[PDB]
RNA sequence: GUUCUAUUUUGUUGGUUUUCGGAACUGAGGCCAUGAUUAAGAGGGACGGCCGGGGGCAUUCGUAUUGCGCCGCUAGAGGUG
């Protein structure tokens, strides 16, 4: 909880891994390595109902809690790594991703570079479902 | 040329060998305007440069998965209308 950075000269960089499933949203801030983490709070930790854990309100509260816990240490800027369900399943991020990103941007985390770290397979295994699908 | 032979014939009775004709075999010729229709918008094949997720064998790469090992923080994570 002690920042060695000079205040006006530069900012301390971290990176958030915004995981956006269709049933929950993870907002996870780690360092430049990713091995050491800083703050992780979810939509289910903020809203105690399973059906709206991936809701933009829950992702917004999770992003506000992440930004407050990160300003408690003094990391100022965050790179953004958007991550989806991935694999054989869906590759489009959920509704909480843009809400959490805009929420941390309003709460005051300096936006670095944004990229997709979605685990898009080259050629995956068999998708969970029948030959007729999830009807 | 070789073998066989219907017989006409030597005035009439007999043999042998020829001229002349028919059957088979066999050598040197002369001639054909000498002799093989075209190459199917039929087909087969050779040859040339290709072309192609065609086939078989060996090798190599890519991610994702799931499981394990180590590290960081955590009370939720999955999943559904
Ligand atoms: Mg079924």
From Swiss-Prot:
GO terms for biological process: translation. There is a cross-link at residues 46, 48, 91 (Glycyl lysine isopeptide (Lys-Gly) (interchain with G-Cter in SUMO2)). Residues 116-135 are annotated as: Disordered. Residues 127-135 have a biased composition (Basic residues). It is found in: Cytoplasm; Nucleus, Nucleolus. GO terms for cellular component: cytoplasm; nucleolus; small ribosomal subunit. The modification Phosphothreonine is found at residue 118. Keywords: Cytoplasm, Isopeptide bond, Nucleus, Phosphoprotein, Ribonucleoprotein, Ribosomal protein, Ubl conjugation. Belongs to the universal ribosomal protein uS11 family. Component of the small ribosomal subunit. Part of the small subunit (SSU) processome, composed of more than 70 proteins and the RNA chaperone small nucleolar RNA (snoRNA) U3. This is Small ribosomal subunit protein uS11. It comes from Oryctolagus cuniculus. The gene is RPS14.
């Amino acid at each position: 909880s002690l920042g060695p950075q000079v205040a006006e000269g530069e900012n301390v960089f971290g990176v958030c891994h915004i995981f956006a499933s269709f049933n929950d949203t993870f907002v996870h801030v780690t360092d430049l390595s990713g091995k050491e983490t800083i703050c992780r709070v979810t939509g289910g930790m903020k809203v105690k109902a399973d059906r709206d854990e991936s809701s933009p309100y829950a992702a917004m509260l999770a992003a506000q809690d992440v930004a407050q816990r990160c300003k408690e240490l003094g990391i100022t800027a965050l790179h953004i790594k958007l991550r989806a369900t991935g694999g054989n399943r869906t590759k489009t991020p959920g509704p909480g991703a843009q809400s959490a990103l805009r929420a941390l941007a309003r709460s005051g985390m300096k936006i670095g570079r944004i990229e997709d770290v979605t685990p898009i397979p080259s050629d995956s295994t068999r998708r969970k479902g029948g030959r007729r699908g999830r009807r």
